[PDB]
């Protein structure tokens, strides 16, 4: 299925599959929403800043894998975003934010400026 992107442009490979059905369909900032970096993982939800992410279309059973390996138990809520490539999922926070850091830019990076 066609996901977003918020780990970085360089994404991860995962295993395999994130470097062989993955589908470049393009770069896609999008506004209006902010990234929290909670330690590990980041997360992103509905705000105010430009999320400088990529937008990739993967095997719909590679989204199963992520889904099942992401939140497994409860940890986060599908964002069903419509993007010009394409419907993609987003992961929104879930759990409290308390304690956590703001990108309010919307970039992994940013500081390079």
């Known amino acids: 299925m066609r996901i977003f992107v918020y780990g970085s442009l360089r994404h991860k490979q995962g295993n395999s599959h994130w470097m062989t059905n993955a589908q470049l369909l393009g770069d896609f900032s999008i506004d209006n929403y902010q990234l929290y970096s909670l330690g590990h993982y980041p997360g992103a939800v509905p705000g105010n800043g430009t999320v400088h992410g990529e937008v990739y279309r993967i095997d719909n059973a590679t989204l ?7 939140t497994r138990g409860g940890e986060y809520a599908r964002q069903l975003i419509q993007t010009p490539y394409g419907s993609a ?8 934010v308390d304690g956590l850091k703001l990108i309010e830019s919307g970039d992994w990076l940013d500081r390079d400026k």
């Open 64 to 70: 199963a894998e992520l889904d099942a390996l992401r």
């Open 89 to 96: 999922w987003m992961y929104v926070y879930q759990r409290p």
